[PDB]
């Protein structure tokens, strides 16, 4: 019962407004503490440079017009509220692809009698990160993800990290990929004096055995046939079939390995480079 009267007292459209953000004493900044929590890295479509993650981002901020006297209301401490009605500092990716920006669920938020708000909606994010594919597959991937309020500059809000590292209490082993460290850092452009943002860096490592067994063994296996054709005697008349077949197989593997690598013309994969070299060698062999 008293919960309903509490909600009607707090959520009065005539008394409480949503479009204006709280501030006192000459437009003081409202500190917004956000920290990320990685659920499970679900996929890395390396061909499209898209990383799909499940994220729980927690956000805390102080708000003064929402307070109430806890003594009168049966000594209640915390109350649940909908997100669509109380104001909320927008925090969304920038390097996000797919058009999707905001969170998916719009959860309920916890409100204490002091006025602090602690809110965490879960979401799925599709970030865009460049693939430094040189040591395929024995490599590392450096994916960046940025948070920032697209609507407010550093004049009403100010983002502050809670902890230096992303939390992994609700993590599951991603299977193929294995994480190393999840650093986070607050950037600050002094030239703009308005630009703020939080950047989390994900350094990811690939467990190599799958690709190894699937591609490296057949590749070196068939390319061991390079210097093999010449020990064959010419009188039998069979060099042509073997050599042309080897060249064809190498072309096939080249096309495949070019299909799996993202078309990043910034650099050439090492495996592809070696395979092109041995292709030139085997055509010199055929001539």
């Amino acid at each position: 019962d008293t919960e309903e009267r509490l909600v009607e007292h707090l959520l009065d459209p005539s008394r409480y407004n949503k479009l204006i953000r709280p501030a006192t004493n000459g437009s003081e900044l409202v500190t917004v503490q956000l920290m990320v929590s990685l659920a499970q890295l679900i996929s890395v479509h390396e061909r499209e440079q898209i990383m799909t993650t499940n994220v729980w981002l927690t956000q805390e901020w102080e708000d003064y017009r929402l307070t109430w006297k806890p003594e009168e209301f049966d000594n209640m401490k915390k109350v649940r509220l909908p997100s669509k009605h109380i104001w909320l500092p927008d925090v969304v990716l920038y390097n996000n692809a797919d058009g999707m920006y905001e969170v998916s669920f719009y959860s309920n938020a916890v409100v204490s009698y002091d006025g602090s708000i602690f809110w965490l909606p879960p979401a799925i994010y599709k970030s865009a990160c460049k693939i430094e594919v040189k040591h395929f597959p024995f490599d590392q991937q450096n994916c960046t993800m940025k948070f920032r309020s697209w609507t407010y500059d550093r004049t009403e809000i100010d983002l502050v990290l809670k902890s230096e590292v992303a939390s992994l209490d609700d993590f599951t082993p991603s299977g193929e990929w294995d994480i190393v460290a999840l650093p986070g850092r607050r950037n600050e452009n002094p030239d703009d004096s308005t630009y703020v943002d939080i950047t989390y860096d994900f350094i990811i490592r690939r467990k190599p055995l799958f690709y190894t067994i699937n591609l490296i063994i057949p590749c070196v296996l068939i390319t061991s046939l390079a210097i093999l054709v010449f020990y064959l005697p010419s009188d039998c008349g069979e060099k042509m079939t073997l050599c042309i077949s080897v060249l064809l197989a190498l072309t096939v593997f080249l096309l495949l390995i070019s299909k799996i690598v993202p078309p990043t013309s910034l650099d050439v994969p090492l495996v592809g480079k070696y395979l092109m070299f041995t292709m030139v060698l085997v055509t010199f062999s055929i001539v």
């Epitope: 040189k134 230096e164 939390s167 992994l168 209490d169 650093p183 350094i203």
Partner: antibody, heavy 118, light 113 residues
Framework: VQLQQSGAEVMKPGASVKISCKGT????????IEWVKQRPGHGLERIGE????????NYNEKFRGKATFTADKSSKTAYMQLSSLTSEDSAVYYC????????????WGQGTSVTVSS | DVLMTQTPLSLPVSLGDQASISCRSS???????????LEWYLQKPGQSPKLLIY???NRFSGVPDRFSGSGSGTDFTLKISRVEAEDLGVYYC?????????FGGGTKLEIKR
């Protein structure tokens, strides 16, 4: 932040010993924890590190099959199962926090002295 | 494993003197990003190791300025300006390029008279 370890331990050769590492004051399940082995004679060698979030482990090529780590997420504790023990491994063991490619190794443990003799 | 060699084994130097210690790697330990991740450690007798230099081109927050470190792509040198009574102990190297990580050999350092 603060680190805790187990007390002194003695055992007959050939058996197994499990030492504990307690951590508080930070996000325990967020970054690596590596241990350092120091023989009372000289040198510093590692034993391995684990990520208390996942089961991602690695070992130095000299101590393969000698130690097996284990981490717990609910209780902020890292364990290590020890293989067949010989009288050449009686030394002092450490624990420390670490994070690759960035700021790292700013705190330590207090030291765990393990001695093995008949 | 990238083995590490420290030189010398023991370098007795008196109070106020400048001392230089070299730390060489078996391979190149420069990461593809363009930054070499190496650590210097200080251990005192009967205590846990301390930190003085991380990311050699940088310095730790809490260590005085008398310490300095630099080096080329492979050869590394830790330098001290004025030796005090507190800097007694043994130094160590730690590389952060390849997996697994490794320490050095241990460089002994005491005073001389």
């Amino acid at each position: 932040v603060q680190l805790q370890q187990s007390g002194a331990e003695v055992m007959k050769p050939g058996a197994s010993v499990k030492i504990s590492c307690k951590g508080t004051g930070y996000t325990f399940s967020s970054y690596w924890i590596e241990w350092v082995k120091q023989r009372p004679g000289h040198g510093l060698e590692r034993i391995g590190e684990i990520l208390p979030g996942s089961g991602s482990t690695n070992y130095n090529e000299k101590f393969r099959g000698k130690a097996t780590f284990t981490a717990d997420k609910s209780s902020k504790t890292a364990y290590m199962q020890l293989s067949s023990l010989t009288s050449e491994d009686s030394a002092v063991y450490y624990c420390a926090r670490y994070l690759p490619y960035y700021y790292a190794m700013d705190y330590w443990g207090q030291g765990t002295s393990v001695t093995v003799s008949s | 494993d990238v083995l590490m060699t420290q030189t010398p084994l023991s370098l007795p130097v008196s109070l106020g003197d400048q001392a230089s210690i070299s730390c060489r790697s078996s391979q190149s330990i420069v990461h593809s990003n363009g930054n070499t991740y190496l650590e210097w450690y200080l251990q005192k007798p009967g205590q846990s190791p301390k930190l003085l230099i991380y990311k050699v081109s940088n310095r730790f927050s809490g260590v005085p300025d008398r310490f300095s470190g630099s080096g080329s792509g492979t050869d590394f040198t830790l330098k001290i300006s004025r030796v005090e009574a507190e800097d007694l102990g043994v130094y160590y190297c730690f590389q952060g390029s390849h997996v697994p990580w490794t320490f050095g050999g241990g460089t002994k350092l005491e005073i001389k008279r």
